[PDB]
From a paper:
The OX2 orexin receptor (OX2R) is a highly expressed G protein-coupled receptor (GPCR) in the brain that regulates wakefulness and circadian rhythms in humans. The orexin peptides act by binding to the GPCRs OX1R and OX2R on target neurons to activate cellular signaling by G proteins and arrestins, particularly stimulating Gq/11-mediated release of calcium from the endoplasmic reticulum. Two structures of TAK-925-bound OX2R with either a Gq mimetic or Gi reveal that TAK-925 binds at the same site occupied by antagonists, yet interacts with the transmembrane helices to trigger activating microswitches.
In parallel, we solved the cryo-EM structure of OX2R coupled to a DNGαi1/Gβ/Gγ heterotrimer (referred to as OX2R-Gi1) in digitonin at 3.2 Å resolution, representing a Gi signaling complex. In the structure of OX2R-Gi1, N3246.55 hydrogen-bonds to TAK-925’s carbonyl group with a distance of 2.7 Å between heteroatoms, however in OX2R-mGsqiN this distance is 3.3 Å. The overall conformation of the OX2R-Gi1 interface is similar to that of OX2R-mGsqiN (rmsd for receptor and Gα subunits together equals 1.3 Å). However, the OX2R-mGsqiN interface features more extensive contacts between OX2R and the mGαsqiN, resulting in burial of more surface area (1039 Å2 versus 814 Å2), Notably, the interaction of OX2R with the Gi1 α5 helix is predominantly mediated by hydrophobic contacts, and Gi1 makes only two polar contacts to the receptor’s polypeptide backbone. Meanwhile, our functional data shows that OX2R cannot substantially activate Gi in HEK293 cells, however the caveat remains that we did not measure this activity in transfected neurons.
Author numbering:
A (entry chain G): 9 to 62
B (entry chain E): 2 to 121, 124 to 235
C (entry chain R): 55 to 194, 208 to 255, 293 to 333, 339 to 379
D (entry chain A): 5 to 55, 182 to 233, 241 to 354
E (entry chain B): 3 to 340
The structure:
Amino acid sequence: IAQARKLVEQLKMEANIDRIKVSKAAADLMAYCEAHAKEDPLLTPVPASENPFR
Amino acid sequence: VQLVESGGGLVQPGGSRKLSCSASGFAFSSFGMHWVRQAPEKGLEWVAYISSGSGTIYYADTVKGRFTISRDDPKNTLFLQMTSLRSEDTAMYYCVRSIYYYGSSPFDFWGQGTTLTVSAADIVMTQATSSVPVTPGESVSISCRSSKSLLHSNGNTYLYWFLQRPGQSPQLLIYRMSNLASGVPDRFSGSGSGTAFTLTISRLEAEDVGVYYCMQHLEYPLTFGAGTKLEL
Amino acid sequence: WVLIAGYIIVFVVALIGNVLVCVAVWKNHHMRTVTNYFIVNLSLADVLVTITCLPATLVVDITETWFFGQSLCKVIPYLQTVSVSVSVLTLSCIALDRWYAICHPLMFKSTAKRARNSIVIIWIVSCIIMIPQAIVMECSTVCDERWGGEIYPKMYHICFFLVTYMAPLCLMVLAYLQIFRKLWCRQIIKQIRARRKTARMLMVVLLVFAICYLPISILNVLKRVFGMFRETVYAWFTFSHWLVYANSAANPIIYNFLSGKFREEFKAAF
Amino acid sequence: LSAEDKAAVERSKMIDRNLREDGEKAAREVKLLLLGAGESGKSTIVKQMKITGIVETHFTFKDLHFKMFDVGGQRDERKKWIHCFEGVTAIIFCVALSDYDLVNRMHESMKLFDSICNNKWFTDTSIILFLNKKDLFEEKIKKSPLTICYPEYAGSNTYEEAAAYIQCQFEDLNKRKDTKEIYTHFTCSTDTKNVQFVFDAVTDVIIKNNLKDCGLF
Amino acid sequence: ELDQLRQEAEQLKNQIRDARKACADATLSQITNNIDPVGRIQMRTRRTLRGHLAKIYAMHWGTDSRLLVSASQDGKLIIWDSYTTNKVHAIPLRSSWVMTCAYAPSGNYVACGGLDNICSIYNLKTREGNVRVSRELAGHTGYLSCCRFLDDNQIVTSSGDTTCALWDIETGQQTTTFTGHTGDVMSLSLAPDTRLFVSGACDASAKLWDVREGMCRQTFTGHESDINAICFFPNGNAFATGSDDATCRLFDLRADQELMTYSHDNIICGITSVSFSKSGRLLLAGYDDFNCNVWDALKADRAGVLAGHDNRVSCLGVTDDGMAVATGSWDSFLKIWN
Ligand SMILES: COC(=O)N1CCC[C@H](NS(C)(=O)=O)[C@@H]1CO[C@H]1CC[C@@H](c2ccccc2)CC1
């Protein structure tokens, strides 16, 4: 009933959405990881001097 | 929150007396409590301290043993039993709240004081000036020069700035040299570095005139400053 | 000649069992139960006794000649006897803890704090209640006891017999008798089988402890208190010490490897 | 070194002592989980034992502190929050014994009992099930046989035989036998007896737990 | 008509699927093959905060990345000072059944929910000493699985009634109820700009809403079972969702489809928490095999295992500055790794 109308309406408004190729999103994720790679203590173990945990 | 103190009288020198601090509003059980005296003309001066649950007690070197400080949480009271009152203890005593946890506001609330007349290794902290002329609106600065660097190894630089308006109980302005006690206007700012600190007032109002006391909390006793009185 | 073989097998079995129990209760995060504190203390005292007293008794009863110095004979008997006493006291405390956890479960007097307090008190009382054995020792060629009288040793050894056998055995008997009574009456096929298995477990523990520590208790309370004592004496002492060390070796198996919970935990812990 | 961090550590130790005391006094309280089946007289037994989300009916009996957790008023995926109830000393249950002809309802109750008595979380917690409405059940069975709710039933259509059959079928659902004995009661006596049964069954559960931990079974 | 409406919805969903498939030329794995792997990263247990006497079901690092609030079922949530292991507060709970926790961005307030269906918001910076319950938000028909603070005034909660809510704390009433889910909303996660969040529910789907008006902007499928946890790629344009089928995926908002999945054959256990590193490269994941596997959210190749917990890890969180990752498990001990 009314819930069905709501579901069809939300699916309709979901269909009309700009969609970019997975290549662009993957490239953006890779670029973001690369740009901030040097600022991730877990990824790059910082020296114990600059490590608040010891 | 309210601290009401009683037990001030013309004690004969060398006698004994008891001072009571009744606490209302706040959870007195969890709050450590200091007793801080002040001579009729001189500046503040630390007297005694009790932690939460009475686990730890400290006294100033000049009242060690003579003054015994205790507390009773169920009755919500703080007692200072002081014996052999020499003429140097003719001071008004304040009951100062203090809670110690990361990012806390120790010494935030001060009691109303009890006038108390008696018949006839530390860290010296100097105040560059004791009296300055202040215009109502012109920014001013106050300097506090310590002796031992207060910039502890863990970043914290324990140095508090208190304000005592004329005829009132001093209130906490700044803690750890760059902060603001709740309800304090942002005009007050703290800066400097270990062994030399500054308190800057921007757009000074008529409600800021008073005496500004510099305190350290690195280690007991918590030697206060000499006070830098402002004037109009 | 089989006495030496028995001593060696008891030695190895006791050490292996004690080390297995210690590692299992310390390298496993699921074995921090309150009773496991008593069990690990028992295993500690057990390894300590089986390592200290066993070689000493073997050399002193097979060669009839002391093989150590004056200070060594002044110290080793104290460690020997305090280890045995703390072992027996830990068995008694285990029995009392089981009584509380079974006969009186609703007051919950089985907290880890109580276990630590009991361990500390038994340790100190064992080190203290029988401290004379450390000072009264004298060295001749076998080092033995030297007393400045007869009444004093009589009282000391009768008290030692009371604290090592009579009191712990009476406490264990009372505790396990009441536990068995509750498990036999307080039930209102598989339940009956489990109850009888528990009765078997309790009887095994109680009878093993009572029988194993009986010969030595009687020998000490008749040799010293009554002044008795030697062909048969050597054999009786050797057999008694062997069965004490058999009890020491069995304690790990009797208390831990015979329980399904601990057996499963150990199997899954290795 | 620890200028005022000493005071912070003192506060930490104070509240750690408070936490330890709270834990010690909470370990001496038996936690029961009351499931029921919906419209199964849960409120009646709750009131008798007393003497939004979930209502905790904390009460005391013979110096034993029972904390009863009624989760009936919660419609959602049970498996997602059921694991919160590991370690509950007992799992009370309720069955609308008079609801044998209602609709089938007892069949849904049996399904719920099977689901909650065989969960991987409750593989050791015993179940204390009450077959409420014994008198109403007797009247209903007198009105009509029990074959309606159970075609396989073959026995006298009397209170004793029918109650025994229901009790046997509800004790037959616990697949994980030999590890969780379930105590069955007929909560219809309007007297201070149901709480007594809960107490003398929780004491049995505690004894079993103690002798399991002590290494005696 | 009901039947014609249903078939129209089905064909619209098919159009959604084929459109999103057509907009996928190369998977993330192919593009990320060239970049070198993160290798093996061994992080030790710098701290082990041991104050709880029961299971801990949630925590949240503070904005300053030093204070972490952790809620247990013993009726307490404790505000640990991770640097020194001190506890600054031990807040008791009206109902000891707590299944979530949140620490306000400003640090003044904390929030905790649970089976009681009430999100209790406690005020810490109060001039009284004791922590006081600022509010008790109520209105959810089921338990609260995850509550996150938007500001000191707005809190988004996810409940078991298949809906999310945006409570305005001051008035203590829902200002927007997000509907559209068909099962328990098990987890929630806010954007870095907090302009739109996502919710993962038991219906095996993660929904992207938009708090401003409260409509599911996007819906993501692919999981074969529940979604026990979600987090965002710090970029704010991709999120990774755990699940109960032992698999955490990585969806992207812009392309609006699954990018890749992190499943390893010898794991058959459901997730309980997911988090990213501040750089977003390595993806934490709290498995209930008593350990959390540090993945590499560009190639799916596992990069480490923080196996140090006796029981299931039920909560996980990477500090705001990325300096440490705290994992809390049902053994009542939560450990900080670095
Ligand atoms: C004749 O045995 C003894 O009464 N001993 C005690 C003094 C050290 C003696 N050691 S020794 C002979 O010089 O090598 C000896 C051996 O004690 C070990 C430790 C204590 C044990 C025990 C004894 C009595 C009652 C309950 C237990 C027996 C075994």
